[PDB]
Amino acid sequence: NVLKTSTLIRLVQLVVSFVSLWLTAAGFLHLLENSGDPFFDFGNAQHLTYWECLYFLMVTMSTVGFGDIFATTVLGRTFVVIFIMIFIGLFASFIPEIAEILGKRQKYGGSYKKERGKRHVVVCGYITFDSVSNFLKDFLHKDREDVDVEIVFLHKGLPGLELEGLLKRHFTQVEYFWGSVMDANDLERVKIQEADACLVLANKYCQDPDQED
C-alpha cells in the first residue's frame, strides 16, 4: 500500500507503461532487423544492437527522425509504420502530463528559521502585490524608528510575478510561505507562538464584506 496519493499513482503508471512499451518495441525491432525478412530467405538483414534500436525508436517517437539509423527489412519498415501511428500519440501525451505532474510541487514550502534576537510578525488574509506593497512601504518606511522586525507572509496562493519580485527586493527581512492560518501545522511552520503579533488584512473591494469579515 505504498502509492497513497492519486497524482503519485498516475506518475508511476505513466512512467512504467511508457518505459516498458519503449523497451519492448526496441526488442521487437531488434529481432526483426537482425533476423531479416523471411520471404527473402533471411538474406535482407541489418545488424543493429539493441541500444541502436532503443535510440532509433526514441528519435522516431519524438518525430525528430535523424535517419542516421533506419529500418531496412520489410518487417522492420512495416513495424516502424505501425509504431509511428501508435507511439507519436503516446510520446506527445506523456511528455505534457509528466511536465504537469512535476510542475505541481509547491515552491514556497518549508518553515521560518527563527533567529537568536529578531522579533517577527506574521501577516495573512488578503495577500496580493497591491496589499503587500502598500503594507511594506509603510511598515518598513525610512521615517520609522530603526527596528529589525521580520515580516512573515502566510497565504494559500502562489505569489504572482510582481509579488515574487517584491519579495526578492526585501529578501533580508520579508519571508513568504504557502499555507493557511486555518491549519495548526502552518501556524507552527511560521512559529506563531514566538511572533510579536499576527496581522490579518482584508479585501476592501470584495463582492460581500460580511462574507469577508
Partner 1 sequence: TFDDAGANVPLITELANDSNVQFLDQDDDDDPDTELYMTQPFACGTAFAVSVLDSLMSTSYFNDNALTLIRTLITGGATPELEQILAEGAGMRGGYCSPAVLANRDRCRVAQISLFDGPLAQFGQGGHYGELFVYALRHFGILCIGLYRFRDTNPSSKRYVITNPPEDFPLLPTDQVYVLTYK
Q: How far is the CB of 193 from Mg ion (least distance, A)?
A: 17
Query: CA–CA separation, 22 vs 56, rounded Å?
Result: 11
Query: CA–CA separation, 207 vs 77, rounded Å?
Result: 64
Asked if 162 is part of the footprint of partner 1 (rule: CB under 8 A), the reply reads no
Pick from partner 1, Mg ion, none: which does 185 bind, CB < 5 to 8 A by kind?
Answer: partner 1
Point out the annotated binding site for Ca(2+): 143
Point out the annotated binding site for Mg(2+): 115, 150, 175
Tell me the site size for Mg ion, rule CB under 5 A.
Answer: 1
Nearer to Mg ion, 20 or 169 (CB): 169
DSSP 93-159: HHHHHHHHHHH-S-SS-S-----SS--EEEEEES-SHHHHHHHHHHHT-TTS-----EEEEEESSPP
Residues 166-185 that bind partner 1 (CB under 8 A): 183-185
H or E stretch covering 33: helix 6-35
Residues 182-211 that bind partner 1 (CB under 8 A): 183-185
CA-angle at 130, arms to 129 and 136, nearest 5°: 85
Q: How far is the CB of 9 from partner 1 (least distance, A)?
A: 21
Point out the annotated binding site: 115, 143, 150, 175
Pick from partner 1, Mg ion, none: which does 211 bind, CB < 5 to 8 A by kind?
Answer: none
Pick from Mg ion, partner 1, none: which does 183 bind, CB < 5 to 8 A by kind?
Answer: partner 1
What residue has cell string 509504420? 81
Q: How far is the CB of 195 from Mg ion (least distance, A)?
A: 13
Tell me the site size for partner 1, rule CB under 8 A.
Answer: 3
Pick from Mg ion, partner 1, none: which does 85 bind, CB < 5 to 8 A by kind?
Answer: none
Which residue from 176, 173, 200 is spatially nearest to 190, judged by alpha carbons? 176
Give phi and psi for 121, each to the nearest 5: -130, 130
Q: Please, which residues have CB within 8 angstroms of residue 122's CB and are 6 or more apart in sequence?
A: 152, 154, 181, 190, 192, 195, 197, 198, 199
Residues 145-204 that bind Mg ion (CB under 5 A): 150
Pick from partner 1, Mg ion, none: which does 102 bind, CB < 5 to 8 A by kind?
Answer: none
3-state helix, strand, coil in the chain (%, to 5): 50, 10, 40
Give the footprint of Mg ion on this chain (CB under 5 A). 150
Give the footprint of partner 1 on this chain (CB under 8 A). 183-185
